[PDB]
Amino acid sequence: GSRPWQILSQALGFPNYDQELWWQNTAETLNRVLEQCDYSVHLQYKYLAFYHKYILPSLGPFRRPGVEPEYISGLSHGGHPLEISVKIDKSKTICRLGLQAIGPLAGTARDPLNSFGDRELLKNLATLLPHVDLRLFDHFNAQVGLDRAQCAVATTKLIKESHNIVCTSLDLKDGEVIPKVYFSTIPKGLVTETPLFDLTFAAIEQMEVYHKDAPLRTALSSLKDFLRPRVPTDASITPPLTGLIGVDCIDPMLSRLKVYLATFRMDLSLIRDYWTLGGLLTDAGTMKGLEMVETLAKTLLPFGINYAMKPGTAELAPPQIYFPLLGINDGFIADALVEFFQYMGWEDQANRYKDELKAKFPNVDISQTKNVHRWLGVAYSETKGPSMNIYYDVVAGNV
Amino acid sequence: GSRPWQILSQALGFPNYDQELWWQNTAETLNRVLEQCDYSVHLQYKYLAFYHKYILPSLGPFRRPGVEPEYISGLSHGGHPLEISVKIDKSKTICRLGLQAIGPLAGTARDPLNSFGDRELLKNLATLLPHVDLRLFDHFNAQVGLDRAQCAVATTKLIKESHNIVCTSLDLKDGEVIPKVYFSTIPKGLVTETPLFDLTFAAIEQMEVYHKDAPLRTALSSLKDFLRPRVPTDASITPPLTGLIGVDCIDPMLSRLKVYLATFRMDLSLIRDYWTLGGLLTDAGTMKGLEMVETLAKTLRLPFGINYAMKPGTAELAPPQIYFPLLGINDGFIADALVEFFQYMGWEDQANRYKDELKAKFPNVDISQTKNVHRWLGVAYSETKGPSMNIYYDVVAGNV
Amino acid sequence: GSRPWQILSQALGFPNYDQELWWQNTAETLNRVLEQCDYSVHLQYKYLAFYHKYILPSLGPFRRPGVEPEYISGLSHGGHPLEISVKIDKSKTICRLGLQAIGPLAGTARDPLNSFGDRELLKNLATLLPHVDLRLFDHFNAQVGLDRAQCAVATTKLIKESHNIVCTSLDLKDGEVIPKVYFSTIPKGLVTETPLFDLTFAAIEQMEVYHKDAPLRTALSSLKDFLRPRVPTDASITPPLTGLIGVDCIDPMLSRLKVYLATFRMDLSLIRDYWTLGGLLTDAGTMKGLEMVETLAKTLRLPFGINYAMKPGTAELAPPQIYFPLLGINDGFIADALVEFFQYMGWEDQANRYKDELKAKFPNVDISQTKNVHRWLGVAYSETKGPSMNIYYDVVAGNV
Amino acid sequence: GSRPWQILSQALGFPNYDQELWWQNTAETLNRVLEQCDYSVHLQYKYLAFYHKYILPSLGPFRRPGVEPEYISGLSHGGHPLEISVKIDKSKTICRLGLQAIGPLAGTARDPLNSFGDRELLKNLATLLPHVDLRLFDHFNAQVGLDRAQCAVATTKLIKESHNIVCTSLDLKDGEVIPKVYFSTIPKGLVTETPLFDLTFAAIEQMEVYHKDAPLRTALSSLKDFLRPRVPTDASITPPLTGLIGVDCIDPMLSRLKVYLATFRMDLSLIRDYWTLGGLLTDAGTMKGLEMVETLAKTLLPFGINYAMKPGTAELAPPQIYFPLLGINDGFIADALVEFFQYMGWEDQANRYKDELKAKFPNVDISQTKNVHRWLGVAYSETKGPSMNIYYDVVAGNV
Ligand SMILES: COC(=O)[C@@]1(Cc2ccc(O)cc2)OC(=O)C(O)=C1c1ccc(O)cc1
Ligand SMILES: COC(=O)[C@@]1(Cc2ccc(O)cc2)OC(=O)C(O)=C1c1ccc(O)cc1
Ligand SMILES: CC(C)=CCSP(=O)(O)OP(=O)(O)O
Ligand SMILES: CC(C)=CCSP(=O)(O)OP(=O)(O)O
Ligand SMILES: CC(C)=CCSP(=O)(O)OP(=O)(O)O
Ligand SMILES: CC(C)=CCSP(=O)(O)OP(=O)(O)O
């Protein structure tokens, strides 16, 4: 064969069988996504060669019948620590990878919450890529990381699929690899009996950039004013809750700080309350985005609400909202998205979605699966416009 | 041979020649120091095996004639990223290793200040040892580390032996390995054109434990009041200066925070000023330590060091540890001086064995002829623990 | 804990969980065997450190409930590629390790018969140990190894526990590590449809040392004359058969060449036929060994083994080593039988300690309840060295 | 940049600085050679990704001012264990890599003759490539390899650049990687005081394939009849001598066995004696090849003569002859080859040689270098026709 995923298999082979199985269950889809997103052949080789060298060893064992790994990830249905997502606009689509980098003692007494593998991966990316900055990672790792004893405590109070402290995404954008990370607040909250709100904002307010940037301190107090009445004041894990803190692994003055809420209830009034920050945002841009989100939910794991802030900007923007799609028929989802894209006037996206979906996941019949689409994120930005993020359980789509 | 260093060579061999050379110029001395400090044979194997597995690969290429590494360390005279030290009390002597963990791209464009190797080692120590903790490492790495472009700027403003941000020490204490790290403030100060005093305290004041611990804040407040009129208010790298921030890689509530001053000027009057915090400390214990330190200086190039160590839950400053620079002074003279100081302290047994044991620690060089083997001598007095002496050796200088 | 196996765990930790599990189910027993054989503490550290560094990564995944490796070994009952043996004389007891070095793609399409891992280990042993020699390994790898397509054919004609071409033993003798290997003739016989006898002797007769050494050729000629009417002339895999070729990984002029027969039928008459080479050997030493072997059999599923060992510069065959298969027979009964045989041999001290030491070697299982821990018992008599007994243990079966 | 060598640098980075320097001094030229030989872009990525993963770590340290490695290779002027060669016909050109794979203790007491690194590389290729066969390697490694003590002896009697037992070539042909190896007879001859002739033929006559193939035994006795009067009968290292044994790492029934003579004298009468095997080959094909070789030498380290035999074939063919080009001006060499290609009627090769040469080695002025062309090999085959092999010191052409 002569497609890049095939050529790279032929050129590089595999250090071990797990890496080979990961390639066999993901690289073909990845090359198809890249192709369908109009990445050049040179960028397809770039990202697939990157994937081979850096990501395959980070994915740990390939969970399969008869081989049960010590560490089970909540990123996918089968426990595989990988997702592939697309960020769609009217005119372009970006591919992103989401993973946990699995350490070799992950899920055992010497590393109960997989505390080390992501930062090792990011260390290797820092020597690969000139623009990668580890200072925000390190800052939040210091604030919400746990020692081994604490990690062992947390594993006693959390389901197997939530034994995590961090996870990593890689945006494959502008011919670069752009890393970002999310940190879990729940283990520290549980182990220290600290309110999740308190620890989130304590960690944020100790950032060097917070100390240097008045506009960020302005946006953050507004967010605190919105969130304080809505999340617990005590130490319980009662949604709605501040469950993740996200940063970009770039210059801290350029990084978006993300505060992610998880909740199990989402009805119209809450979508409204989240999206407008309780009536704080009432401008036409926010309201057009709201219409979009209400329409999506009508046309169609916790819900996600992600508030993203940037140094230099004092005003909050509407969040990105995440809908879990696990349990919903994938062909139905496809047909609903086609409708939604037509509603948005993204005609070319509507005309190609379903056929391109089948071509991403040729081993599976999408009319009969319910776990291939895992999440959908919807956003509206004053400057970039509407976008949709679709997260796929790539392993479910290949096995 | 059947000594532990030899047995482990025979059992383990070496992955590459540089590691073999490191072992050949350090492992015998380390085994000797361990023996001399009355470590059991089982602990000697524990530490030498640990050294072989964890430390040898972290030391990088062995700088030698015809082979010049990309990365040159300031830890030793020959550019080797290694020191061995002993801390001597009344009751016992502890051995400690000091290194920089050299990344494989260190001192090139992809890693100009060797920014990654020490954290890599510490990660490996965290799955090895159950009480190793990375949170203070990570905090100070966030606050005084630099991105690649900044690291590149810093190499244009620093001599080649100062292209570093962190180094690591490992106390071989009880039967454990206890890691500590020290972060340099100079690269960030130079790149951001920020006074060293300001960026040092800015980084400390953002610690989680600073926010939780009134006693630590109070101690730090007293230290700032002492330091502010003595160290530069401008961005200059001139003495005395706040050059390093030390932490123990343990539960941050138990970690000592160390602020290390470097300076070239020292006389009995400055000894008193540092030791007593300009008259703040006046008690019997402080004045007794002061007398000891004065006597050492009388009995006796790199800067002097002054290390102020603070613990969460302690509100008051104690006197610092004072480090005497010994590079360039003949090592036989130093051994005679130490024998004298030991007798002055009443440490007869230490006085009577110091010279013979020195010879025996460095059998492949005549230590009476060298001037680089003793690098530093630190002296401290604790109300709790009594007086102690830290002797730091350039092990490679004592072996090549 | 302060025993060497514990100290090395504490010093070294583990690269991954499988290695940790291997250490947790084998290292205590190995330390016990070493102690029991009167190895000094320095040798105990030497061998345990060697085991940790070289052997743990070679053992592959630790087969356990919920985790089924791609490659299953025939060396043990649970599929683990490991055995520990002791060779007991009048004067002393030597410990030996037996393993297959598992490649990372072993038992998949890219490496169906685990064809690479053992040579990789041996390469690492050659830079570790100065008297390790790869030439006979390489010779037999050339003559009875198979390419990938052939290896794939062989997996269709063999049970999963027999997907192998080579295995390795390491004698822990004097203060050294002495490697030996054994090559299987079965895969090549099956794939090429060639009689095992023919391909075994073809491979031997192409040795450089065969061409240089008349005495070896003469010995081999006598062995062929004995074997030819007893083993199949056709291509069948039926007993008695020439199933393994053993060599020592040393100077080929000093290496013993071993031809190992497997067979299921054994009674006193066949014992005599094997031991005396069908009446060829009639001397006092041979008949005395014969009596010993007969008594063992009376005192006492896997095939019997018969191992004919030949040395360059020796023209005459000596009696073989005979291996009794013990899998499935209760281990407390075996211990009682061995005590009886030891008393018969006059080895009182061995008789008096066998059972207590067995218990102590396998402290996490009750060896009186098991039937898989003793796997093999080999017995030999040398004119030169006297009688000896090799006991092979499924260490993992004695620990899980 | 977007050329494959650049893309792969961006995607993969480097495990260490030596590997980065090797890439910086060879990968650009390699991509240019591949390009100039009309390899597709997919094969350029195949071979460059292979190069990165398998060959860079095998090349050991990058010898440079201030960094003197323990092991110095005789493959190049600067001591670098690498060459890049092209095999030219009238219609196509094949690129090949020649190296020694450098072990981490090479040239020190634990590995005095670099005895291990090639077989480790070949082990990794055997899991990469289905067609790679290690049985001939192992056979000859057993016959001419030395133990450590013996290796240490040999290093006392041989120059630093001849402390070798094996070397490896990789033909980049038909979208595959095809390995072949040469083994050095000199260390064993020196250490055992055995005649080189005796040990060469002893090793060959112990091959399993020799025992199975009458035609090969027929060709080999003819070669012995030719060589016995011409090389030493005693154990001295007096050229002409049988100095290398070459095999292909493939099915032993398909492998060409090569017996390489080294000599320091080459005049017309010897070229004649070698090429015709002493008057044994007098057919028109042999004689047309002879004309070619005589013309080449007129138009333009020991000389090389390589006799290659294949199982199933009883008759010998003319050897390939190797001319060392070290010390001769590279622009002169270029202009001479241009003339030679015109004499052969390879007009298109003549018209492109010099410009393509400069483009392979843009960092150097070929009119002023004398070490870029290291060797030239000339062959004539009954079935494939004439061919020329040109061996470049790629590091000399880049530094
Ligand atoms: C927001 O949802 C999540 O936190 C996770 C894991 C999870 C958490 C709680 C649940 O009840 C079910 C799943 O579900 C996911 O699909 C997912 O990607 C989760 C996740 C996984 C790894 C992390 O490091 C963080 C979040
Ligand atoms: C035929 O020439 C050679 O053997 C080598 C090494 C060499 C050998 C003898 C000399 O007088 C000068 C150089 O010169 C080379 O250019 C070369 O590639 C040689 C060589 C290198 C590595 C090997 O493993 C075998 C031969
Ligand atoms: C971890 C999960 C489920 C969502 C993360 S938010 P995101 O970073 O993917 O969203 P954007 O990439 O910022 O558009
Ligand atoms: C490495 C340098 C110059 C000083 C280190 S201070 P220290 O950690 O050795 O002092 P203590 O070990 O706390 O006595
Ligand atoms: C591995 C099997 C079944 C037999 C090995 S025979 P051996 O090498 O153990 O016999 P000796 O060690 O030579 O006594
Ligand atoms: C090692 C040297 C200098 C020559 C080897 S002969 P060769 O294998 O390169 O020639 P062919 O590839 O067979 O054309």
Query: What is the full DSSP assignment across C111-153?
Result: -TT--SHHHHHHHHHHHH-TT---HHHHHHHHHH---HHHHHH
Q: Quick one: tokens of C65? A: 């409930």
What residues contact D333, with CB distance under 8 A and at least 6 apart? D300, D325, D373
Phi, psi (deg, nearest 5) at residue A178: -115, 110
Query: Which of A137, A141, A301, A326 gets mutated to test ligand 1 (max ligand atoms within 8 A of its CB)?
Result: A301
Mutate to test the interface with B, among D16, D17, D102 (most CBs of B within 10 A): D17
Distance CA C85, CA C87 (A): 7
DSSP state of A359: H
From A106's Cα to the closest Cα of chain C, the distance in A is 8
From B15's Cα to the closest Cα of chain D, the distance in A is 7
Angstrom CA distances, D143 to B262, C135, C137, C179, D217, stand at 65, 7, 11, 20, 18
* Secondary structure (H, E, C), D251-312: CCCCCCEEEEEEECCCCHHHHHHHHCCCCCCCCHHHHHHHHHHHHHHHHCCCEEEEEEECCC
Distance CA A8, CA D112 (A): 36
Estimate the crossing angle of helix B284-299 against helix B331-345, to 10 degrees: 150
What residues contact C327, with CB distance under 8 A and at least 6 apart? C77, C301, C302, C371, C372, C374, C375
What residues contact B245, with CB distance under 8 A and at least 6 apart? B140, B144, B182, B183, B185, B200, B203, B204, B257, B258, B259, B260
Which among A325, A356, A341, A344 is positioned nearest to A37, based on CA atoms? A356
What residues contact B70, with CB distance under 8 A and at least 6 apart? B106, B107, B108, D17
Please tell me which residue of chain B has the smallest CA distance to D67.
Answer: B67
Angstrom CA distances, D245 to D1, D125, D184, D223, D376, stand at 43, 21, 7, 14, 19
For residue C91, the SS3 value is coil
Amino acid sitting at position B356: D
**Partner B contacted by D68 (CB < 8 A):** yes
Distance CA A218, CA B97 (A): 47
Distance CA D208, CA C143 (A): 7
C-beta of residue A271 within 8 angstroms of C-beta of residue A297:
yes
Estimate the crossing angle of helix C268-276 against helix C284-299, to 10 degrees: 150
- Residue in this structure with the two tokens 């098991």, named with its chain if needed: C370
Please, what is the Cα angle at D132 between C135 and D260, to 5 degrees? 65
Please, what is the Cα angle at A21 between A15 and A25, to 5 degrees? 135
Distance CA B83, CA D33 (A): 49
**Does B105 contact D16 at a Cβ distance shorter than 8 Å?**
yes
Helix, strand, coil % in chain D, rounded to nearest 5: 40, 20, 40
Q: CA quadruple D198, D203, D208, D213: dihedral positive or negative?
A: negative
Q: Could you identify the atom of ligand 5 that is nearest to the CA of residue C307?
A: 6
Q: Could you identify the atom of ligand 1 that is nearest to the CA of residue A260?
A: 1
Ligand 3 pocket, residue A182 CB under 6 Å: yes
Give chain C positions within 8 Å (CB) of D127. Answer: 103, 105, 110-111, 116
**Does C49 contact B8 at a Cβ distance shorter than 8 Å?**
yes
**Partner D contacted by C40 (CB < 8 A):** no
Distance CA C390, CA A348 (A): 77
For chain A, state the CA radius of gyration. Answer: 20
C-beta of residue A259 within 8 angstroms of C-beta of residue A242:
yes
For residue B66, the SS3 value is coil
Which among B220, B192, B189 is positioned nearest to B204, based on CA atoms? B220
Distance CA D144, CA D156 (A): 18
Which among C53, C16, C361, C118 is positioned nearest to C45, based on CA atoms? C53
**Cis omega before residue B252 (within 30°)?**
no
Distance CA C110, CA C106 (A): 8
Q: Quick one: tokens of C158? A: 């063999």
Element (H, E) at B168: strand B166-173
Print burial letters for D319-357: b (CB count within 10 Å at least 16), e (below 16): bbbbbbbeeebbbebbebbbebbeebebeebbebbbebb
- Name which of D123, D135, D139 is nearest C120 (Cβ-Cβ): D123
Q: How far does the centroid of ligand 1 lie from the alpha carbon of residue A76, in Å?
A: 9
Please, what is the Cα angle at A112 between A111 and A114, to 5 degrees? 65
- Residue in this structure with the two tokens 């063999």, named with its chain if needed: C158
Distance CA D280, CA C107 (A): 51
Helix, strand, coil % in chain A, rounded to nearest 5: 40, 20, 40
Angstrom CA distances, A35 to A3, A44, B205, stand at 10, 7, 50
Query: What is the full DSSP assignment across B262-296?
Result: EES---HHHHHHHHHTTTT--SHHHHHHHHHHHHH
For residue C49, the SS3 value is helix
Distance CA C104, CA C106 (A): 6
Q: How many C-beta atoms lie closer than 10 Å to residue A234's C-beta?
A: 11
Distance CA A31, CA A23 (A): 11
Phi, psi (deg, nearest 5) at residue A170: -130, 115
C-beta of residue C76 within 8 angstroms of C-beta of residue C375:
yes
Please tell me which residue of chain D has the smallest CA distance to B103.
Answer: D16
Q: Quick one: tokens of A302? A: 């916790």
Give chain C positions within 8 Å (CB) of A68. Answer: 66-67
Distance CA D219, CA C1 (A): 69
Q: How far does the centroid of ligand 1 lie from the alpha carbon of residue A83, in Å?
A: 12
Which among A232, A167, A169 is positioned nearest to A200, based on CA atoms? A232
Q: Quick one: tokens of B340? A: 């004298």
What residues contact D301, with CB distance under 8 A and at least 6 apart? D324, D326, D374, D375
Distance CA A205, CA B51 (A): 40
**Does C105 contact A16 at a Cβ distance shorter than 8 Å?**
yes
Estimate the crossing angle of helix A117-128 against helix A135-144, to 10 degrees: 170
- Residue in this structure with the two tokens 């990316």, named with its chain if needed: A125
Amino acid sitting at position D87: K
CA D120 to chain centre: 19
- Residue in this structure with the two tokens 């010497």, named with its chain if needed: A110
Distance CA C190, CA C162 (A): 12
Distance CA B287, CA C382 (A): 80
DSSP state of B14: -
Amino acid sitting at position B40: S
Q: Quick one: tokens of B294? A: 């004065």
Q: Quick one: tokens of D274? A: 């070698």
**Does D145 contact C135 at a Cβ distance shorter than 8 Å?**
yes
Angstrom CA distances, A261 to A136, A184, A191, A194, A232, stand at 20, 11, 20, 17, 12
- Name which of A7, A40, A128 is nearest D42 (Cβ-Cβ): A7
Please, what is the Cα angle at B206 between B205 and B210, to 5 degrees? 60
Which among D183, D168, D179 is positioned nearest to D126, based on CA atoms? D179
Q: CA quadruple C287, C289, C292, C297: dihedral positive or negative?
A: negative
DSSP state of D50: H
Which among A345, A339, A392 is positioned nearest to A364, based on CA atoms? A392
Distance CA A375, CA A305 (A): 12
Amino acid sitting at position B259: V
For residue D238, the SS3 value is coil
Q: Could you identify the atom of ligand 4 that is nearest to the CA of residue B392?
A: 9
Which among A365, A396, A399, A364 is positioned nearest to A77, based on CA atoms? A396
Q: How far does the centroid of ligand 2 lie from the alpha carbon of residue D74, in Å?
A: 5
C-beta of residue B330 within 8 angstroms of C-beta of residue B371:
yes
Ligand 1 pocket, residue A239 CB under 6 Å: no
- Residue in this structure with the two tokens 């099956």, named with its chain if needed: C190
Phi, psi (deg, nearest 5) at residue A302: -85, 155
**Cis omega before residue D240 (within 30°)?**
yes
For residue C185, the SS3 value is coil
Phi, psi (deg, nearest 5) at residue C128: -80, -50
Strand partners, A184: A244
Query: What is the full DSSP assignment across D123-181?
Result: HHHHHH-TT---HHHHHHHHHH---HHHHHHHHHTS-GGG--SEEEEEEEETTEEEEEE
Experimental method: X-ray
- Name which of B119, B131, B147 is nearest A133 (Cβ-Cβ): B147
Strand partners, D82: D99
Please, what is the Cα angle at A218 between A212 and A223, to 5 degrees? 125
Distance CA C94, CA C77 (A): 24
Q: Quick one: tokens of D207? A: 């091959």
Distance CA B219, CA A206 (A): 20
- Residue in this structure with the two tokens 């016995």, named with its chain if needed: D228
Distance CA B245, CA B224 (A): 14
Decide: residue C251, CB within 10 A, 0-12 exposed, 13-18 middle, 19+ buried: middle
C-beta of residue B178 within 8 angstroms of C-beta of residue B170:
yes
* Secondary structure (H, E, C), B355-398: HHHHHHHCCCCCCCCCCCCEEEEEEEEECCCEEEEEEEECCCCC
What residues contact D140, with CB distance under 8 A and at least 6 apart? D181, D183, D203, D245, D247
Amino acid sitting at position C162: S
**Cis omega before residue C240 (within 30°)?**
yes
Strand partners, C171: C96, C178
Q: Are strands D93-99 and D166-173 parallel, antiparallel or unpaired?
A: antiparallel
C-beta of residue A102 within 8 angstroms of C-beta of residue A59:
yes
C-beta of residue C316 within 8 angstroms of C-beta of residue C213:
no
From D40's Cα to the closest Cα of chain A, the distance in A is 10
**Does A10 contact D47 at a Cβ distance shorter than 8 Å?**
no
Amino acid sitting at position C57: P
CA D253 to chain centre: 22
Which among D266, D65, D251, D249 is positioned nearest to D166, based on CA atoms? D249
Strand partners, D99: D82, D168
CA B122 to chain centre: 16
Q: Are strands B241-248 and B257-263 parallel, antiparallel or unpaired?
A: antiparallel
Please, what is the Cα angle at A275 between A274 and A280, to 5 degrees? 90
Q: What is the resolution of this structure in A?
A: 1.8
Distance CA D394, CA D360 (A): 9
What residues contact D131, with CB distance under 8 A and at least 6 apart? D176, D178, D250
Element (H, E) at A72: none
Distance CA B196, CA B187 (A): 10
Q: Quick one: tokens of B90? A: 């009344």
- Name which of A145, A149, A202 is nearest B135 (Cβ-Cβ): A145
Distance CA D204, CA D259 (A): 10
| CA within 13 Å, CB half, D181 | 27
Q: CA quadruple D37, D43, D49, D55: dihedral positive or negative?
A: negative
Q: Could you identify the atom of ligand 6 that is nearest to the CA of residue D167?
A: 1
Please, what is the Cα angle at A371 between A365 and A373, to 5 degrees? 90
Q: Which chains touch C (3 or more CB pairs under 8 A)?
A: A, B, D
C-beta of residue A396 within 8 angstroms of C-beta of residue A78:
yes
C-beta of residue B330 within 8 angstroms of C-beta of residue B5:
no
**Does A42 contact D127 at a Cβ distance shorter than 8 Å?**
no
Distance CA C373, CA C394 (A): 5
